Symmetry: C3
């Protein structure tokens, strides 16, 4: 892995800047239709970016709702074995590219008993189990260029962005699907046992997933404002103690794409 | 360091198959109480890990672990005598490999015992707590044994851990205990893994108890996860080798020797229990 | 460099060639203890840079030998926090070196977030127990081959925070008129270096944790493992925010400042504890 220090991040950023003229203000990490809505877009496969982590995923530049965006199509999940530096690099690259707001979605298990399949849970906070347990993405020498040794995670999930997202949902008639909640990261890749889910629920967790927190931590560390939503893709089984016709349509994607586009449209500009 | 991929697992499996004709249906990982199990194995071949190329090496004080093939209650078994505990510093691949080797050897059921601290206040020293579920603290915390490239040959990227502790096997174990007059010693419970090797502080025990944990140990889950991942059915029991101290203001301290002593004392019972379970496993 | 008997001996032997002081008490300066080293008399200051095979922190930390309240001490000025990326062996080595040097009692301070709602900024929370989240999660400092020379494979953490030393510390606080600042509590280690989210703090609090920090437990574990008695205190350098809706937050400069304000008190406290430690 190449260290996510100022020097390497600059190199990758500079390379990307030679491929696109688009200075992204908003970065989006796709937990997939979004990219499709992007206009006047350049698609840069990771494979074409020297020193960029490989998953091939694409970096997509263009405009969305009249805003310059960089979209990550292909994430680096820790359960895959990616290093802290590999996961951190793209976010820090976004920082150097001009990204001020990071919007991310993920799939999560609904722990909260009031959640419904396909609900949206806006992250208003998280519990970073790996981070509490000495697998925090920031462990290692602090990269001072990007942020402080001991980042505070207060307002990690920008309250204004959260308010905005909620309003946009409300206005476009799907406020009923939208919740705010605490996301706990399970390092994965095992789904959580019922005992784990029960514990996580009782810990005050609403949704559980294997992603996002590390990117959020890096983003916050370098001052990028964060908006994150979990799609409740399954209801966690809490009880350790018959198949039907199932529709698994990418309609949450369309809704979520629309939601993101409409949020981006209303983001304050400069 | 040898990756627990299809290629290496096959190599080890193939080597073992050149040493024994026994195709094991049941794999048994001897924890505590099970030291004796191996002894009951009939028509057995004992294959020290040292004699298996690319097989992980363990030792009990310099004495290499053994893979023991033979029959038990008329069933072909492979018995692991010598486990790889993560607190020893073994890698994910080192711990996973033997289970995947068992898979290739024909193992369909994994039976494992371990020593555990009794968190549940209703547990008694030497009670048997059948795992009906677990809390994989290392797993939640980014030290899951499956972290890394998924080995597709063995199982899926995101294994579900529903019915990880096969409910039918649990039911069977309980019946066998009941029938042989020690149902009173047998509980089902949630096992939480402490990575270890420190025993849990009273504050840790209190927390774990309040998290809904019944017993705590430093083993087993990683093997269970690998087993489940490759579709091996799992039966696991904790011997309550000590009652967890929940109160920091207290003399009573966990110690490995007492732990070994409870295993030693219950080993015969547990051996018998396992043998009688194996006897009634569907074939 | 593995913290085995051989390497620890080498480092210890080197140090013993630099100082005649056989330390009975080792002190790890956290927060409130920058000053401690200053009170040390007849002291030799050995920068880590001058100790072959000794871990390097910073500039450069010092090993300080001398007497404090008439007792021979070794003071660590410069710790190895796991969030910096130090290995188990790097963190364990100095403690094991202390063991070989003659250390019988380890006194350590740290900065911590006050989870317990009854805590005040600048309170002292004596550790009476801990929750070693990294340890529960397979990042225990002892993971790896056990170094038998130093201790057992499965150390018990009963009375990890020596009750007698805790009693003493409380008495000393009481006698010197700051018992009101002194609490005993459960310390939970967050691996860090992020401060805890409000959701994390809430969880930790409900887990029965009183203070949260990113240090100490690994040293305590190594100390206990090799039979060194442990006394540990957290300075409450910030009150944990439990509510995400709250502009209010941890500020590291305020942590440092709060720590520093109490250093004199904490130095005095430690000196007065050391003074009353039973001797041989
Ligand atoms: N983690 C752990 N804790 C306790 Cl109390 C034990 N007693 C026997 N094995 C054990 N493993
Ligand atoms: N992990 C952690 N949390 C809080 Cl509130 C702290 N305050 C001082 N050091 C600290 N370390």
């Amino acid at each position: 892995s190449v260290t996510a220090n100022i020097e390497n991040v600059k190199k990758v950023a500079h390379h990307i800047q030679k491929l696109t003229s688009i200075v992204p203000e908003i970065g989006i990490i796709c937990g997939g239709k979004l990219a499709d809505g992007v206009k006047d877009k350049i698609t840069i496969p990771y494979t074409k970016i020297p020193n960029f982590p490989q998953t091939s995923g694409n970096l997509i530049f263009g405009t969305l709702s009249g805003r310059k965006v960089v979209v990550m199509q292909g994430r680096f999940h820790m359960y895959e074995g990616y290093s802290n530096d590999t996961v951190a690099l793209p976010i820090r690259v976004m920082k150097l590219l001009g990204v001020k707001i990071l919007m991310v979605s993920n799939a999560a298990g609904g722990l909260n008993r009031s959640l419904k399949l396909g609900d949206f849970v806006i992250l208003k906070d998280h519990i970073y189990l790996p981070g509490l347990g000495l697998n925090n993405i920031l462990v290692g020498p602090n990269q001072e260029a990007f942020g402080t040794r001991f980042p505070a995670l207060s307002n990690a999930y920008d309250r204004d962005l959260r308010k905005l997202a909620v309003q946009v949902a409300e206005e476009n008639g799907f406020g009923n699907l939208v919740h705010q909640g605490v996301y706990v990261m399970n390092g994965g890749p095992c789904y959580e046992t019922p005992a784990e889910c029960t514990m996580l629920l009782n810990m005050g967790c609403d949704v559980v997933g294997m992603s996002t927190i590390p990117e959020v931590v890096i983003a916050r560390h370098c001052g990028i404002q964060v908006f994150a939503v979990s799609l409740v893709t399954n209801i966690s089984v809490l009880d350790v103690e018959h198949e039907e016709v199932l529709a698994t349509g990418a309609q949450r994607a369309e809704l979520m794409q629309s939601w993101f586009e409409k949020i981006i449209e209303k983001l304050p500009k400069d």
